[model samples]
Target chain A: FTLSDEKRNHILTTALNLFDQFGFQHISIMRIITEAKIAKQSFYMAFPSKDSFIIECLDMEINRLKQSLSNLLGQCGKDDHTSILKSFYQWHVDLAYREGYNGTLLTKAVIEYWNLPDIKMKVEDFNKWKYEIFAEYLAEEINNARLRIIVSAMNGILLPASTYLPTWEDIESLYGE
Target chain B: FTLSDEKRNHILTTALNLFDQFGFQHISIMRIITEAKIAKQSFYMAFPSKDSFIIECLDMEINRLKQSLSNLLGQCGKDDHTSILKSFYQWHVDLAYREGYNGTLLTKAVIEYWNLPDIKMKVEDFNKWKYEIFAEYLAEEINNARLRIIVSAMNGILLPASTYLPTWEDIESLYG
Candidate 1:
């Protein structure tokens, strides 16, 4: 039997909340069941394992981000290097602010899971996806090698800047952002 | 009883192998005990926790590098920014080249754990140490704000450069 859209949304939302609230290691099956107000056995009917549920959350979050990025690019008229870089970091700042409850867990999982192999792979794929998306737009001027290097440097820039500098204020000053 | 110098060295050597080979998280507590050839309980006598042990290793490594930096600075013979930058990234390249390990946990923990309130004070002390050391060297030439910004940028450069660069050969052009 198919779950109603409402029921499925409830399950997915609850699972995402729990997973994002706790790292994969600390999150448990009982917690998911309790959070969703669903029976333990029933969760198995929807998801076979915690890993599968994590994949579902990862896919959902990554796609949501990708869609937001696509919309930003499509709606944005200017596509210069500076504009792209500004939006890139700003998008991150906005997301971090949104994740009030699970900010720490989500940050650690995305940055480095350390425990789970599959979740790490998901994070790795998401990073590669970002590069490929950025590389296409950057193909305008930067040679392939240079474009890749800039993308690499851009990834490095965001976390430490956010972690230490709070906002892009200082780094933005450097880049004229 | 305190550990003899030989015993301490043996433990340090074993822990370094495990860190270099398996990484901090993947290396089990029992494995460290077994590798060190000491009882699991003996570890607590030496280190309060795994995190402390890791920090001690970092202290040892950074201190060793500081000696090399002193030598490099003397060679540079003045406030030469090029030499400073070279010494910084070259040491980065050398540390990264050490086989059997990359510093994923060391970097990740330094950022993650230091941000927590329980740990923030101690981390702040470490930061104060770093800031003072740099200020002692660069204060006359550079203001505090500029020093902070430039050093943060160097940290940014170091992380991914170490992560994805993979080899000194990859960054050969960066070398002196």
Candidate 2:
């Protein structure tokens, strides 16, 4: 929204790119400052510390996903199983097609830091919200088992999906809907 | 087998525990040496460096899982689906019940280091191996789609299964 906002945005963007490329533990504040190309002092001024910086990155990534999902849902415009699967996986395929995409920030955080309750809580809460939205779109309630399998099947691809893109037919082969 | 073997074993076991608890990147060689209670020289003598040490850790963990799986299959004593699943999930449930358990070594490695091609290759090879065994027990060749979903659902539990043991019934819920 403003100049300072741009500074914060750039920092988050750079941090997300780096954090996703390297493990969260591998990326240090000095490294962030170096890549962001700002003075170390100004970097500290931009964000409180590494801990808070990551939480902000999570927020930024999740908000962007929300807008993206909203647009997909708007295009979908129907409450049916076939349409739901189409849009859901279309959203995923769109993700893979994007240049320089590796994985989502939140998914990577969950993989790396599920041991930390703070990180785990946010990721799980977001998952529950998103899953529930899809359940409504499909017009059925999915049990925990169903939910977990769907989640794992979908999320297990975050790392490999970038390297190899699976066609729509392959995904449907499993869904068989 | 030998005292040096004990030192190496201790180092590997300690490294696995620490690495599983903390992400691989988070566990530094210094931290490992300090925790393992060995001299820096001794740590180098034990393993070449972090890179080789991790590869060996992957080796050790995969071997341990192989033996465990073999024992379970022996106890089950039949290639039937029910028996195979019984043993498979019994192996998982036993893991969760063990004191201080968190997750499997290889699964954690995949989550943390899939970007590393060496690490990714080993993990994927082991997965293909393990899944092929299950396919035999099922007496059919599973397609990649079925394979992927089964893998995701099964491997997905490594982390949370420690905190929460989903009953056999719960696992069957979705399969139904």
Candidate 3:
């Protein structure tokens, strides 16, 4: 309420972009201000601290992912398992292949903060939620087991995607056809 | 050569364990010395710098993986792809399920230092070599394509294995 929505949006977008490219551990508040072209005072005015700002950005990302995937819940019927799986992999691939994309901030958080108990738990909770929701969309007998490979394969390739994008062939492998 | 072989081995094992548990960015020379219970002077005597010590650890790991996998190269000839795949996945599970195993040091290095150019390449090179050799164990026309899912799935579970070990059911999923 204190800061204008416009300025807040810029900061969020800038920080998220930087986080996407360089992960949570690499960037600084100064760098965020510099990139967003806002004064340091104004930056703190919008968000109290770096950790708070990161969580806000993560929440916003979850919303963005939600919007992207909202319609996907029942978009495919029981017999259309393949379509849902494709939708899931494509979402992951799109996130990675998008220009300047590194990987999901959720994943980056989990890997980067493995030993940091608080933040690790925070991000891990989001990831577990994401996994459960994504698994729900699959519609299977061993729902969790089948979903494990797809999600795990997606997570597995992300580190390499920093250097090389997963190809069509790679995506096909995920299809499990 | 300057330090005793026994001392060098202790430092390497201690640092590698710390690196495996805490990652390269978090650990310091001070902590390594403290954990290894060695004097700072002796630690530096064997390896001039932390960077050099890390490379030495990486080299030792590659050799260890190589020997563990040496016989695996020809263990399963043609028509034994399933056995080879199981062998690979089982090796990964064994590492993570091994007490205090967070994940592979190679993966931890890559994710922890995505921006750090030199060390990133150092481990990625090792990973690529590992990929090729592991893929060779599989006899298929789309050797690489098939191998990616298997290796990637193993890596995928590692970070989570820090919190929850992938169940036997999860291991079966990697069969595809």
Candidate 4:
């Protein structure tokens, strides 16, 4: 069913606000409709369910993130490791400020709930998140095997560090800047 | 308030097995008691709650690990970096095999359900585990800053590797 452009924009905006504030699970159709000042009937008519609405919001955010990362990565030369690292780190810092990772909801569902129960949702997403930055960083390299090992090591090093990563400054110090 | 020693061991063993099979949260108390062949009353008599039983089991394992690590590390002088590193890595690899690290409950809890509002049971135990490991590993006289960075880096690498680790031969290849 086609919705008016205005209705679609309001739904997306309201979903973003709720997602930013609470998370995907807490929002309800009645609440969004009431808060969005759109009719509950209109909401149901517009979207099939809460899960669909959530996918809409997540899909939009992921697209935005991909675009931002592409722009950031495109500017750096292929072989500049420091530039690669800083841009990678800086993108996360910016993301942290803007979106503030959905620590309670997002990470919980993935790691604990194991709720997705789909290979594409769980495994493929895991590979993509791990390899996207890395593959790009190694795009200009001839040694694919060496690239994989280096990127693998970085993943190994950074996975836990991401939890308590001090700052770009701290990483620099550790790297002996 | 009381349990026979045999029953306590059986309960601990059964509960840990179930926890390793599924997860701590996924296991039900009734199921544990049923599987352990202990009366529900007997289970509560030994431990007040599921969470408490988990704590008792974790505490026992942590102490065992600390004892093993101390014994391993005790052989080396504080300044002997090479000896320390070799022993440390060997100890980790040995423990991984001997303990069937697939059943290592603590790391699973840390990643999965450590600090949720409903289930904030394991955070203290996890922190204690980390503290002991960090202190033990840092017992040598290496540069403290480098030591911290290197140790954290290794942990970040190792946690994922616990499940997804390459073969020992593959790791040996890395050294070559």
Give the Cα error of residue A140 in candidate 2, in Å.
Answer: 0.4
What stretches of model 4 exceed 4 Å from their correct place?
Answer: A1-80, A90-121, A138-170, A173-177, B75-80, B86-104, B107-142, B158-176
lDDT value for model 4 = 0.53
Model 2 stretches astray by more than 4 angstroms: A1-3, A90-104, A114-116, A144-148, A159-177, B1-3, B77-79, B90-104, B107-116, B140-147, B159-167, B170-176
True-vs-predicted CA distance for residue B15, candidate 3, Å: 2.3
Better of 2 and 4 by DockQ: 2
lDDT of 2 by residue, A31-63 (tens): 887898866777667567777788888888777
Residue B104 of model 2: what lDDT?
55
Model 3 per-residue lDDT tens digits across residues B11-57? 89988878777667678888988888788888878898776787788
The per-model lDDT (C-alpha) reads 0.53, 0.63, 0.67, 0.53
lDDT of 3 at A84: 72
lDDT of 4 by residue, B1-176 (tens): 58899988898888777766556666778888888888888778878866677767776656666687678877887766566656655654564455323324554444443334322234344434543554565564544443443334334333322223333343333333
TM match of model 1 to true structure: 0.66
lDDT of 3 by residue, A1-177 (tens): 389989998999998888877777678889989998889999888798877787778778877767677566557676676677677667666665666444457666655566545655655665566677765666554355545665666666554433333454665665565
| Candidate maximizing TM-score | 2
Using all chains and alpha carbons, the TM-scores for the candidates as numbered come to 0.66, 0.80, 0.73, 0.58
Ranking by TM-score: 2, 3, 1, 4
Question: What DockQ does candidate 3 score?
Answer: 0.31
Residue A177 local lDDT, model 3? 53
In model 4, which residue pairs have backbone atoms overlapping below 3 Å?
A: none
Model 3 steric clash pairs: none
As for candidate 1, its clashing pairs are: B20-B100
* lDDT per residue as tens, model 4, A1-177: 557878887988887776554544446677878888877777767778765666566566556656766778778886876777677666545543553333322333333333334412633354355455556564544334333333333333333113332356544543342
Best by DockQ: 3
DockQ of candidate 4 is 0.16
